[model samples]
Target: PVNPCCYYPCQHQGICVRFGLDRYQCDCTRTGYSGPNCTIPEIWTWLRTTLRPSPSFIHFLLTHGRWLWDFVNATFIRDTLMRLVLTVRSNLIPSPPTYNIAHDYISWESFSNVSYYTRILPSVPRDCPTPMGTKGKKQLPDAEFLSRRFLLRRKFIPDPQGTNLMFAFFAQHFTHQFFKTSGKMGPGFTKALGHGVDLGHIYGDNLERQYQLRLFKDGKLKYQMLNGEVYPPSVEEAPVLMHYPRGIPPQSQMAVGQEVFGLLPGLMLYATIWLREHNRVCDLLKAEHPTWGDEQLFQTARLILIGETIKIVIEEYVQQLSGYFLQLKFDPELLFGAQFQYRNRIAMEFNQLYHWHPLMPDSFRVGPQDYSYEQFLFNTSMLVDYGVEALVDAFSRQPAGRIGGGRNIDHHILHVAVDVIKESRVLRLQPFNEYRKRFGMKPYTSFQELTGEKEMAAELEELYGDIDALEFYPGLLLEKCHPNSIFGESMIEMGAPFSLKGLLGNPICSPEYWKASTFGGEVGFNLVKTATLKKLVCLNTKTCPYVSFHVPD
Candidate 1:
């Protein structure tokens, strides 16, 4: 008898048997179906058609059938039911920890290799054929095509509970300090420092050698006071210009050379304030050690700044994201008396995984008025447009978008990023399942297993056909976010360990930079001790009376 399994006729683990001449029967016993080819499952079809209510019936009851259910009453029923379901489901399905246990021994080289070869390899146009192109290749399936089409359009729904806009603003600032790897620059773009936050923006990379040249007579960073606010020195011409809304002049030039500073108005504001803070530290050191030269003052100040950065991140930021406030305490042992070798270079995976685009609000508010991201682009004029006072006030009053709950990539980023990745050949990177395996998580066997949402998984199953074919970025976006976690499990697993190690393992935090002789003895310890983001904002933005920070309970 001919073997039916040889032809691979069954799907979803259905059994097959040779029946008659050149024919076979598919036995979808476990799949709950009985068909010639097991093309359809009878149970699912029956449940959908016979058991479930029709869409028209539900819509009519909610909208037009006032006697049956009025609009107000229907809304209440729907919301309460949803809340009840979610609460019940949440308790039943316990979320896994954000970090992976296997990541402890993972080397920096492994992180870099996974990032470069698996996550962000150069894209090839041939691999990304268009649906309408003459270069004939299989187009994306209808489900996948529709998904991408819908994703390309803006679909931002603000969080019902207020989370505050400072959440996103500070996140952007933190990301800048944590990871910034400059890839190949395009036209009109200049080169950026090739390493991690080397304090290049604040102290200029080789500060020991170049301190006197960069500082003023009073041991302060050179700056120009603009409109009563201190800003880093501006360039007559900037390498890149921000995109502005139509009819607005696109001539806005950001103050600093950092690429991230030019990305958003809030980030620029933080960079400016930090620049001032660095100078303030410089002045403070100068006042204490009157005989000290610019080099001593600058170096000490730089060390303090690094320490402050670490403190705010490990203490405030990590606590907020991880929700492990008490458990994930800053290990003083790692910061002091440790003789660990430091690799100053950032892992490529560090940059890739630190992407928290979902945290960004679709639009930012200025008092009562809200503006889209496009409006804020090169419109750094918004700085002068709304003024620092109003902007800070608005941030305090308005809430940023929530982190998870199936939030997706915003339209602006989705469109631009997809094209850039394809054009730059970054799409050639490995599949999403491979990265999952590399991070020591079990590869998802099905779409439902991957996302934890039956509907979402069904959509993905229709789109990719196989889990191995799913692309990296899309997969990252599609993965189910952990309950109460700031990021998806995979991203958290990839980022948290490496970032913690980088912070703890770096010599900057060890005796080299923090010792009594090198980093100003006890002064260094005092500067970074008990530093909070709230305190930083208050200290830096003295002009903005409305500048208040919130830490979620």
Candidate 2:
């Protein structure tokens, strides 16, 4: 029969099919309706919903959410949940694990897949030291003071360009002027290498006959008189050690080997300062040019000297503070080995140090709303990673087994590092213990206890997964997927007048590194020109054009 049931679809058909009623034979659209009726949200709608939250959260919550207030308001929920999670997790995970202490050859591959440990305590923070400043009223230590003076001499005089300038001025003008006035080249004038006060006795003992020519035929006597006036006698008195009257040996003039001796410390200081100043200048230049090339950097001595001079003048005007450099002495082999060992130790202990705690103990307490388990863990992991890298690099640079290597142990360096780490560890442990005490849990007591085997195993389980449990579990949300990027030139801000739209190939789809790291061809050419002008010749042109263009007539 052409029955009504055949003509009309069942009203309860969707519900009936869900539980498999009447053989679950629910007639519906073959493609879109599935078992019964179309009940689930459309795939397109579902996708939209999922992505909507992300964009909104990133834009609104991150950008404008009053995070401090939000965090404070959510503290109770955060604290309670954290405590429950910690207690349950702790039971599942045991404690007091054995740590890896091998300090030999580093194998990143071996530990690459291992789970990193989080900290339960906070890490102590250190303030960055001030940058070094100009010579001050407070007397520097003998070594430091001498170093500065040495740097000054090298930086100020003895410069090849400066020396050449001095000599050229003297040779072409001063000598002739002296000869014209005195009627002959005197022993003082003849023996001196240049107009500089100390140059008079650079040659050997036959001082009298050194006098050669008196004057030029067309020499302007008035101009010569002006040159003599500029070459003051007092210039010689500045460096008594180098000043020689006449017929003095070069060796005698260098009595203390002051020329070479004075350069080392100054070079070190100059190198450090130069590196810093150049970095800043590079940044400024990049902003103006945008598409500079790798080869378009300041490469000549004259330009560098000018740059340094500018830097010194600016620094003097600004009156800034400076920092200190810690000196280390150690056998390269031994130190490298020790550093590697330190890194391994850090890796082993990281997990235990970053455990979640619920209670706040008196010893660990800093103040209310000061610390959290998650924060502690994150900070501890950072410390572990940093320590590992530092130690490994140090050990790789120098190992400690040779007979003469014992002197290179650099106990002082070790002591300084230890002191810093100790301070950090203390700061870390206190906050964690206080939070732990709040939740009726005890904080970690010893470094060994914090980095033992049980904790490591648990950490591994959490970071990796247990397939045997028949439950698919993902790891921590915040663990990094890759190492941080090392983009040296990415930080520079760029601005240009031309339309850079078509200049960059694949401008729309290319990775950021292409645009950020490499300069365009036109930009590169300008960078080369600018660098040449500034560093090679010290030209007056300050603004460098990065793009080639023709003006419309």
Candidate 3:
């Protein structure tokens, strides 16, 4: 038999040892890779990265290194750049031991028996404060009054980091998938739906809900082809409307995969994109596997779409939010030799902090059409009118209100803001500085220190006497934006780990499920690899104009 070693199966200078006939093991050692033939990039290899890394790898190190190195001359070069990447997996504090008698360790299948939320601080449930206003505690500010005072829109302010309406909308859709709150459950109990990024928003949270939207054939969701354009069926056709914003018939109301998307045109735009993308992927899947049944085809495509969501989120959405020039990616290889288990219990503080309504511009344009704040509400028909291409273009062109600005919200929708504030307060979370300290930033000591606007700071100071007493939600909204980033320092620290862990820890990314068999075959795997938000838009829309999360300079 020809010696397998002589044929050179081992790569990157890895040494091979023969075990038996046609059996050789490649010893990767310091080759900066793992797996047979030393072809796979191991998790640790990202830190001890080789001299010849992918262009994106080199780009990350070169661009992100200076700012990081300035803080800590650190990581023998590559170590400094990739440590934050390492922190993503290592920082995940697995949900405190689940109720299972033997479930001390979490793994790919440990999806149940865990607390719904993972809290950083020992949750001390308390009510109003001197910070709440008066010593008697009865004179505290009304949640609605506070919202009107601070969150009301003053003027349209474009994102300093240059994100557009599309970015804001995408954030809205993305966050909603995992950060759902159990409003009916009330305080003392922050109940939730799916804790992982399962796309329940698009697919419906339960099988009963899913049944209504699923098309019986071709692995596609129910959709209507109106005048040769594809869209989710109108409310008349589907009869499955989002809970609120119920558009009474003859109103051009359209049914959607997710109820929330129906309320706002921006969210509906994304729902339409996913709808078209799913149907297109299904068509490709059918062509690729003539033998596949509708069940097998749809299930596989659903898995593939989840992968698409993860990639675009981290690579496109998160990278833009970070404002770093480095190209981030959906590298599941980061979990290869992990110490922490793969599991997620969506945290409470995460939902409260993600109130980026501040990003909703006072008004926006949809191609040639104009819509004020209230005009955009419960208006599903706009999607059918202008179509996805126009909606995407308009969202991409207009700048959203900066993520941390005030007066960008409409009083028309201020009631929702009131609901959000009261909801967070009811959770009785720790003060603003506590969360700040937890995320490795200096806690705010004075009003002036938290914001540059003296008037805003003064009002906050009056609301809560000591900076230590500042509430979590208010502080999160008002905190100074980090340089070149869309959100504040604490926002990045807390948000990054949860988003990455929840995203990467997805079942498909697991070693067992991450196989060509799971995605139907190698071709389907590569198809998913090639997915991007822009490609997704162009794939399903005719003559689609440019689609992006950033506005062109």
Candidate 4:
């Protein structure tokens, strides 16, 4: 009998199986090869054998060559050209209208007026063409259909580098601290207006008094006595539900613990740390002033908490994001002794632009184990499964995703977010070009000019037809990211300035907050100065001894 194995030679020492007279198969299990005849090596094997050494050498050449090239000619070739372009652009474009610093104050009324101002500005006409689709019974146009599709087709790619889960935790914590708009009511968009203040601190608005009562015993935030370690008090129900299956307590049952505290394990960890910090402050005050009452102790501790939060944000988060260490400063002058009026209103556009969904990784590593993003979503039960040490150690080792297009954002999240926006009437937002005009930047006449990507421009043009017809969110996402910008130029111009103005202008940093009677004066001010994310993690987690505070570059 003719042997099929001898007739067809497999490249690797693969097993040959004959099923019929002419049918045979080669199993490449022994070799690293795959495919019909074991002719193709697995991608990893190919990479290891063929490209590994060359890749390292190429990387070295590119990095060093680029550095040398830039050192020799970057100023003349790039900087000078950029400066000329900016100068010419400045001359050609009309400057944005100047706002009276005196008039901008942090109040609901101020927020309302600014919102109205944004609405009246020229935007994509409501009658503009849209994508074709059917919502319920009504037929929609191409613009609307494209908007929905773009959102639904949202894509996420893993960071070429890894991801740091800690950033997501911080982002959620920051969002809770800064803003949370109430659910839309009736039929109009007014209900979407923001209601929460910058003072959410550790306790959110809805659960503040409850948490204060639960966390505090005789005016001090409670702590665990086991092994003398500090941890937040546990509860019977998490505020949010985690994804099903792997999510403990199951979808049928209520999750156990404090509301925000039970939302995610990362949030839970941060909450524990902050709760410990609050109690630490309380103890410090108790030692200094035995005469102070529970209310005074609580209030002082709360003040210190807010101050430390502001310090970390300005000192760490903002500095890291902007890469503008010299320009941005946590001026105690701005916090104290400055004669500036505080205008702390959350802008509608500011909240809209604050979307940083791309920063989240599609998966997270916890020590030896890897978990999908879905597995951790809204699930605090994982806290026990992985333990704090594994979670922190994993986060410390992983690098976070880069903040631009091409695989950063997950598709499902993009779809859900777009649906939410459309359902909430947020799609009524102005066009991309209008926002650019508002920001004193030149508006593109074509998608090509806007994105500089041939394929992207064609796709956008095919959908919208006119440059002015581009939707806000899609446009923001597609625009080429600016140099050293997390989002792009539009976001940096529109969102950052507005947020910084709100943060710096808030009364939280005013004399009233800093008064010795209210803030504990020098003690509280010094406490804020001493605060850092690294120190907080070290104080709260057992893994801190093994994990570095900052992820290495």
| Each prediction's whole-model lDDT (CA) | 0.52, 0.22, 0.68, 0.53
Model 4 segments more than 4 A misplaced: 1-163, 184-201, 206-218, 222-229, 236-261, 325-327, 332-339, 420-427, 483-485, 515-517, 542-550
lDDT tens readout by residue for model 1, 1-553: 3333433455433445556765667667755455665657676755844664542243233334445444333455544543332232222111121111112122455344312221211112232333211211254444335435423435664433334666667666655643543356321111223244455544433333234224455556656666777665543322233333445332345445344566577766666767777788787787778999876787777677777777777766655555431223443443343334444334334444555565566777786788997797655567656655566677766655544444445666655435433422232334556556545355678877767788867866776667666655556656765544444666655555556654554456555555556656666567777566666666777554455444232
Instruction: Give the TM-score (vs. native) of candidate 1.
Output: 0.66
Per-residue alpha-carbon lDDT of candidate 4 for residues 1-553, written as tens digits (9 for 90 to 100): 3444433244444545666875678768746788887878887878755644432243244235546645544344443433332232222111122211122212354334432222212222233233211111122224345545443334544333333557656766666554444343321123212222344535444344435334444357644433455555433223332233444553332222223445467776666667777777888888888888877787788777777777777666665564432223444443343334555444445555666666666677776677786677766557655556667667767766555543355654665456534532333454566567555455678988777678868876776667765655566766766443445566655555565555555556566565556667678778877777777667656556334424665
**Full ranking by TM-score:** 3, 4, 1, 2
Candidate 2, run of 10 with poorest lDDT = 490-499
Greater lDDT among 1 and 4 belongs to 4
Q: How many clashing residue pairs are found in candidate 4?
A: 20
lDDT of 1 at 548: 44
Q: Is candidate 3 or candidate 4 better by TM-score?
A: 3
Error of 4 at 352 (Å): 1.7
Assess candidate 3 and give its lDDT. 0.68
| Candidate with the larger TM-score of 1 and 3 | 3
The runs of at least 3 residues in candidate 3 whose Cα sits more than 4 Å from the true structure, single-residue gaps closed, are 1-83, 88-92, 96-118, 125-140, 187-192, 239-241, 244-247, 250-252, 405-407
Report the CA-based lDDT of candidate 4 relative to the real structure: 0.53
What lDDT score is found at residue 545 in candidate 3? 76
Per-prediction TM-score: 0.66, 0.16, 0.79, 0.67
